[PDB]
C-alpha cells in the first residue's frame, strides 16, 4: 500500500532507529494498568447465553391469636433478573515483512497493549460508565451520595460519609481510593498538628497506603480510579458481580479483507493483495451492580450534585421530592421550573435560593442541589417509568 499509513504498519518513520547497535531499553517505561474492578468485585461463572439470578421478595407473615381465633393465611413471592455478556474487540495490521522482522518486538508489545487497553475499558465501563454497552446493569458513578475528604479524612470517611450509608442500612465493607489522594491523608491532622494515619517519627507510609485497614474495612489503592472531581469510592462491594466468557482471543490472518472506512462508506483492503498480516482480538464480559446507592463517591471539596427528574410523559397527578430525608410539599406533574425550585427551597433547612438550581422544562427537570435528592411518584396516575437519576457534567 504505502509508507506512513495511519491504520496499518509498513516500515514507517517511527521504526527508523531500531536496527542500529546504539539501541537501549526504555529506561522510563510505565508498568501496565491492570483492571481494578476485577480485583475487588466477586467473579461469577458465566456462559455466552447469560445467567438468571433469583431473589425472594414476599413479606410472609403471622399474627398473635386467642384460643379458637381462626388462623390467618399468608403467601410468599419471588422474582428474577438476567445478565447478558457484551463483547469488546479490536484489530491491528502490519506488513508480512514487518511481522518477519518483528522490529523492537512491536508485535509482542501490541499484544500487551491491547490486553491492557481492554482491562482499562472494563474499569471505565464499570466505574465512570464512559461507554457501557446496554447489557451492563448500572455503573458506580450513578450513586446519589457524595462526601468531601479534604479538610480531615477520618471525619470524612468514618463519620460524615458513613452516616449517609448506615441511614439506608447499606453496610460499609471496602474503600477504593485513587493514588492521587495521598496528600489529604498526610494532611489529616489533629488540633495539635500531629497526623492521624501515621505515628512516631514519621518514617513509614500512612496505614491506608500500606493497603491497611481503616476502621476495620480494607483499603484498595489504584492509579486511575479518579474520574474528575471524584477520587474514590466507599461502600458495599459485595453488591457488584462480574463475569468473563472464555478468555482473551487472538485470531490471525494474511488473506481476509478489511474495510478501513465505515459500514456506510466502504474502503476495502485485501490483506493478500498488499501482503499484510492482521490480528483480531476479542473478549466478552458481563456486569451487575445490585444496588448503585450502596456506594458513596469521595471528593476533595464540598461540591453539589446534579440530576434528571423524568415524568415519563405522565398526563395527570402529583409527585414528591426528598432531600437528605426532609420531604417536599405535594407537587403537580406539569409544574413550572420556578414551581419546582420553589418546591425545593420550601424544604426545612439549608436550601438557599442562590445555591439550589433548576434548569429543565415541564415533565423533564434537570436539577442541581447540595444533597441526596430522591423522589416518590405515588399519586401520579400515569408515566409508570417516572424516575430520578444523577447525570454527568460536560
Amino acid at each position: 500500500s504505502a509508507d506512513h499509513s495511519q491504520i496499518a504498519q509498513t516500515k514507517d518513520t517511527m521504526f527508523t532507529g531500531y536496527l542500529d547497535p546504539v539501541q537501549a531499553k526504555d529506561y522510563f517505561a510505565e508498568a501496565e494498568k491492570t483492571s481494578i474492578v476485577q480485583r475487588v468485585a466477586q467473579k461469577i461463572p458465566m456462559g455466552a447465553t447469560g445467567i438468571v439470578i433469583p431473589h425472594w421478595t414476599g413479606d410472609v407473615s403471622a399474627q398473635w391469636i386467642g384460643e379458637g381465633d381462626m388462623k390467618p393465611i399468608t403467601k410468599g413471592n419471588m422474582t428474577k433478573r438476567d445478565v447478558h455478556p457484551a463483547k469488546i474487540a479490536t484489530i491491528f495490521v502490519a506488513s508480512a515483512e514487518t511481522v518477519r522482522a518483528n522490529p523492537a518486538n512491536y508485535l509482542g508489545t501490541m499484544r500487551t497493549k491491547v490486553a491492557t487497553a481492554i482491562a482499562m475499558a472494563f474499569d471505565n465501563a464499570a466505574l465512570h460508565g464512559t461507554n457501557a454497552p446496554s447489557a451492563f446493569q448500572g455503573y458506580l458513578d450513578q450513586s446519589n451520595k457524595t462526601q468531601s475528604i479534604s479538610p480531615n479524612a477520618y471525619q470524612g470517611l468514618g463519620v460524615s460519609g458513613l452516616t449517609k450509608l448506615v441511614t439506608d442500612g447499606k453496610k460499609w465493607t471496602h474503600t477504593l481510593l485513587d493514588d492521587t489522594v495521598e496528600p489529604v491523608l498526610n494532611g489529616s491532622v489533629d488540633a495539635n498538628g500531629r497526623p492521624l494515619f501515621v505515628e512516631s517519627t514519621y518514617e513509614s507510609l500512612t496505614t491506608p497506603f500500606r493497603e491497611g485497614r481503616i476502621l476495620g474495612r480494607p483499603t484498595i489503592l489504584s492509579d486511575h480510579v479518579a474520574e474528575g472531581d471524584v477520587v474514590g469510592y466507599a461502600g458495599d462491594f459485595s453488591q457488584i458481580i462480574w463475569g468473563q466468557v472464555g478468555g482473551l482471543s487472538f485470531d490471525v490472518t494474511d488473506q481476509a479483507t478489511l474495510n478501513l472506512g465505515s459500514q456506510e462508506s466502504p474502503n476495502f483492503v485485501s490483506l493478500w493483495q498488499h501482503n499484510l498480516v492482521a490480528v483480531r482480538v476479542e473478549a466478552e464480559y458481563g456486569l451487575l451492580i445490585n444496588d448503585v446507592n450502596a456506594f458513596v463517591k469521595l471528593t476533595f471539596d464540598p461540591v453539589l450534585t446534579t440530576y434528571a427528574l423524568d415524568l415519563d410523559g405522565a398526563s395527570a397527578g402529583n409527585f414528591t421530592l426528598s432531600l437528605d430525608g426532609k420531604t417536599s410539599a405535594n407537587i403537580a406533574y406539569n409544574a413550572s421550573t420556578a414551581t419546582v425550585k420553589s418546591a425545593i427551597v420550601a424544604i426545612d433547612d439549608g436550601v438557599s435560593a442562590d445555591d439550589v438550581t433548576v434548569t429543565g422544562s415541564a415533565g423533564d427537570y434537570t436539577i442541581t442541589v447540595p444533597g441526596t435528592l430522591t423522589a416518590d411518584f405515588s399519586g401520579l396516575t400515569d408515566g409508570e417509568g417516572a424516575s430520578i437519576s444523577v447525570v454527568s457534567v460536560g
Binding site: 461463572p45 472464555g246 478468555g247 482471543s249 487472538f250 485470531d251 490471525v252 494474511d254
Partner: protein, 450 residues
C-alpha cells in the same frame, strides 16, 4: 481451579496460531508453490511451469532414516545383574512396551515430523477397553503426535509442560471433530465438536506431571521452544536453485535456437501472403532458397543463448547445498569422486554420521522421560532411583562396512586368547541388545554339544 471449558477454548486459539507458522516450513518439505521460487525472467503465462527443488526433502530424509533406537540401559544397584539377567529386568520391561506399541514404526515417523516442524510430542495413557482395541491391556498405550494435531505450553522457568491440547480435525471437513485437554491432575476429552459440542469425559491420573512430553530439535539452549531443521540457510539455496532452474526451463523453450531474419525485399516481393503474413517454405533438407534480393538484401540471425551459462550456476549452488547440509557430496550428485575405499566411506559420511549422533542424544533425552512417566503411571509408586540414570541405546548411523569390522574383531578376540572379552566382540561387531541376548542361547547350544 482454572476453568477447563475456558482453557479448552483458549488452547484451541493458541493451537491454531501455531499452524500459521508451520504452513511456511511444511511448504519446503512438501515443495508446494512458493512466492520466492518463481523464475523472474520467465513470461507471465510460462510462470505456471514451476520447478520444485528437493534439497529439504533430501536433507531431512538423510537424517531421519539413519536414526534407530535399539534398547534401554538402566544401571542397576550393584549385583549379579549389572545391566540385565535376560528376563524380568528393567531393560526388558521397557523394551516390551516399546515393541507392544510398535514405536519402532511410529517414532521413525515422529523424528521426521520433529525435524520438519521443529518439535513433536509423546502422549502416555492407560488403554481403555471400552474405547481402544488391538493393544495389550496391561501395557501403557504410548502415542506420538505431531504439532499439526497437538500443542503444549511450557512453564519457561521449570522448563516443564503446564497443559496441552490434542485437536483432531474432521479430515476434509476443515473443522475440529474432537479435542482432548491434558492437565497435571487429569486428562479430559469432549468426544464430539461437530453438530453439538458434547459434554466432557474426564479421566484422573496419579502423576504430578502432565502426561505429554515434547521431542524438540533444540540445537542450542537459547531455543527455548524447538526449531525446524530446514534452516533459513538451506531454504535460501533451495529457492535460489529453483529460480535458476526455472529461468533455464524458459530459455530451453524460447532461446536455445537461433532466430533467423531477412532484411531485403518487401513481403509481397518475397511472395508472402499479405492477409496471413506467411508462406510455406517447403524445407526438405538440401534445397536452396533464391531471392531477387533488391536494394542490397542480406540475411542474418540472433544467436542461440548458451544454456551452459545456467548449468555453471546450478553446479555452484549444488556445491553450496552440500556444504550447508553436510550431506555426503554424492547425495547432491555434486561431484563424481565416488569413495571407492573402506576408509574413504568413513571420511565422506563423517559430518552426516556425527550430526545424526547428536540428534540421537537430543531425542534420547525425551524418550527417557516418556518411559519414566510410563513406569510411574503403570506401577503407581515413585520410580526406583536407577530410572533417573537411564540411557537410550541407538544403532550406529555409519554405513555397515561389515567385512572391515569382521577382520578387526576376529584379530582382537584371537580364539579367546585375545585382548577383549567375547561379549565386547559382539558389541563392536554391532549386533543389537536383542541379538546379543538371543545369540547367547546359541552359544550355550554349541558348548552343550561340544
Amino acid at each position: 481451579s482454572i476453568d477447563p471449558e475456558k482453557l479448552r477454548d483458549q488452547l484451541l486459539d493458541a493451537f491454531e496460531n501455531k499452524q500459521n507458522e508451520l504452513k511456511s516450513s511444511k511448504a519446503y518439505y512438501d515443495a508446494e508453490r512458493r512466492p520466492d521460487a518463481i523464475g523472474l525472467a520467465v513470461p507471465l503465462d510460462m510462470r505456471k511451469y514451476l520447478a520444485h527443488v528437493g534439497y529439504p526433502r533430501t536433507y531431512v530424509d538423510a537424517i531421519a532414516e539413519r536414526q534407530e533406537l535399539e534398547g534401554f540401559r538402566i544401571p542397576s544397584a550393584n549385583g549379579e545383574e549389572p545391566e540385565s539377567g535376560g528376563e524380568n529386568d528393567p531393560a526388558s520391561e521397557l523394551w516390551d512396551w516399546w515393541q507392544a506399541n510398535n514405536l519402532d514404526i511410529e517414532a521413525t515417523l515422529g523424528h521426521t515430523d520433529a525435524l520438519i516442524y521443529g518439535t513433536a510430542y509423546i502422549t502416555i495413557s492407560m488403554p481403555d477397553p471400552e474405547v481402544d482395541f488391538d493393544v495389550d491391556p496391561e501395557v501403557p498405550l504410548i502415542r506420538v503426535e505431531p504439532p499439526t494435531a497437538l500443542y503444549a505450553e511450557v512453564d519457561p522457568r521449570t522448563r516443564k509442560v503446564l497443559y496441552a491440547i490434542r485437536a483432531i480435525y474432521g479430515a476434509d471437513g476443515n473443522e475440529i471433530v474432537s479435542a482432548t485437554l491434558y492437565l497435571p491432575d487429569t486428562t479430559m476429552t469432549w468426544l464430539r465438536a461437530e453438530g453439538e459440542w458434547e459434554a466432557p469425559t474426564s479421566t484422573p491420573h496419579g502423576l504430578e506431571m502432565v502426561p505429554v512430553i515434547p521431542i524438540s530439535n533444540r540445537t542450542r539452549l537459547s531455543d527455548l521452544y524447538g526449531t525446524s531443521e530446514i534452516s533459513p540457510e538451506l531454504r535460501s539455496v533451495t529457492d535460489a536453485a529453483a529460480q535458476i532452474l526455472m529461468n533455464m526451463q524458459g530459455t530451453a523453450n524460447l532461446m536455445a535456437i537461433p532466430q533467423r531474419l531477412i532484411f531485403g525485399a518487401k513481403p509481397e516481393e518475397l511472395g508472402i501472403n499479405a492477409e496471413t503474413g506467411q508462406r510455406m517454405f517447403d524445407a526438405y533438407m538440401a534445397r536452396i532458397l533464391a531471392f531477387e534480393g533488391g536494394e542490397g538484401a542480406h540475411a542474418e540471425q540472433f544467436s542461440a543463448a548458451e544454456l551452459r551459462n545456467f548449468v555453471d550456476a546450478l553446479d555452484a549452488l549444488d556445491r553450496k547445498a552440500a556444504s550447508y547440509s553436510g550431506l555426503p557430496p554424492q547425495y547432491l550428485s555434486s561431484s563424481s569422486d565416488n569413495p571407492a575405499s573402506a576408509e574413504a566411506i568413513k571420511a565422506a559420511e563423517s559430518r552426516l554420521v556425527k550430526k545424526v549422533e547428536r540428534k540421537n542424544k537430543i531425542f534420547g533425552g525425551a524418550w527417557e522421560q516418556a518411559m519414566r512417566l510410563a513406569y510411574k503411571m503403570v506401577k503407581g509408586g515413585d520410580i526406583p532411583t536407577e530410572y533417573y540414570r537411564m540411557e537410550t541405546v541407538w544403532r550406529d548411523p555409519s554405513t555397515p562396512t561389515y567385512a572391515a569390522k569382521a577382520d578387526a574383531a576376529a584379530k582382537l578376540f584371537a580364539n579367546g586368547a585375545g585382548l577383549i572379552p567375547r561379549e565386547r566382540g559382539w558389541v563392536d561387531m554391532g549386533y543389537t541388545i536383542v541379538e546379543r541376548e538371543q545369540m547367547r542361547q546359541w552359544l550355550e547350544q554349541d558348548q552343550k554339544q561340544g
